[PDB]
Amino acid sequence: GLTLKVVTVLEEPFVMVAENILGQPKRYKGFSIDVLDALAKALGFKYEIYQAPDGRYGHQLHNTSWNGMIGELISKRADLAISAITITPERESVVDFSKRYMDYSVGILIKKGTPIRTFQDLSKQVEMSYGTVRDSAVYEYFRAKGTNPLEQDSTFAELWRTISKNGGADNCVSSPSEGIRKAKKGNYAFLWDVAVVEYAALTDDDCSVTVIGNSISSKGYGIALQHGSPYRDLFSQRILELQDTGDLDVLKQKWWPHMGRCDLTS
Ligand X SMILES: *[C@@H]1O[C@H](CO)[C@@H](O)[C@H](O)[C@H]1NC(C)=O
Q: Which stretch binds ligand X (CB under 6 A): 7-15, 60-68, 137-145, 222-230?
A: 60-68
Q: How far apart are CA 39 and CA 30, in angstroms?
A: 14
Task: For the segment 175-204, give every residue that binds Ca ion (CB under 5 A).
Answer: 193, 203
Figure out which of the listed residues 18, 55, 253, 263 binds its own copies, where binding follows CB under 8 A. Answer: 253
Asked whether position 257 contacts Ca ion by CB under 5 A, the answer is: no
**Angle at 213 (CA atoms; ends 212, 218), nearest 5 degrees:** 160
Q: How far apart are CA 1 and CA 206, in angstroms?
A: 47
Q: Which is nearer to Ca ion, 129 or 203 (CB)?
A: 203
Q: How far apart are CA 149 and CA 84, in angstroms?
A: 30
Out of ligand X, Ca ion, its own copies, none, what residue 215 binds, judged by CB under 5 to 8 A for its kind, is none
18: part of which helix (H) or strand (E)? Answer: strand 16-19
Figure out which of the listed residues 65, 75, 118, 175 binds ligand X, where binding follows CB under 6 A. Answer: 65
The 90-129 site mask, x for binding Ca ion (CB under 5 A), equals --x---x----------------x----------------
The 137-166 site mask, x for binding its own copies (CB under 8 A), equals -------xx--x-x-xx-------------
Task: For the segment 62-121, give every residue that binds its own copies (CB under 8 A).
Answer: 87-89, 92-93, 96-97, 99-100, 103
* Residue 176 amino acid letter: P
Bridge pairing between strands 3-8 and 80-81 = parallel
Please state the closest distance from residue 248 (CB atom) to Cl ion, in A. 13
Q: Which is nearer to ligand X, 93 or 166 (CB)?
A: 93
* DSSP output for 31-83: HHHHHHHHHHHHHT-EEEEEE-TT-----B-TTS-B-HHHHHHHTTS-SEE-S
Asked whether position 147 contacts ligand X by CB under 6 A, the answer is: no
* Residue 12 amino acid letter: E
Q: How many residues bind Cl ion (CB under 5 A)?
A: 3
Q: Which stretch binds ligand X (CB under 6 A): 57-65, 80-88, 148-156, 205-213?
A: 57-65
Nearest to 222 by CA among 198, 239, 237, 234: 239
* DSSP output for 107-169: EEEEESSSS--SHHHHHT-SS-EEE-BTTSHHHHHHHHHHT-TTSSSTHHHHHHHHHTTTTTT
Residue-wise burial string across 154-163, b where 16 or more C-beta atoms lie within 10 A, e elsewhere: ebbbbbbebb
92 is in an annotated binding site: yes
> 3-state DSSP call for residue 245?
helix
206 is in an annotated binding site: yes
Please state the closest distance from residue 100 (CB atom) to Cl ion, in A. 4
Please state the closest distance from residue 69 (CB atom) to Cl ion, in A. 18
Closest residue to ligand X using C-beta atoms: 63
Out of its own copies, Cl ion, Ca ion, none, what residue 218 binds, judged by CB under 5 to 8 A for its kind, is its own copies
Q: How far apart are CA 137 and CA 91, in angstroms?
A: 11
Asked whether position 135 contacts ligand X by CB under 6 A, the answer is: no
Figure out which of the listed residues 4, 95, 100, 262 binds Cl ion, where binding follows CB under 5 A. Answer: 100
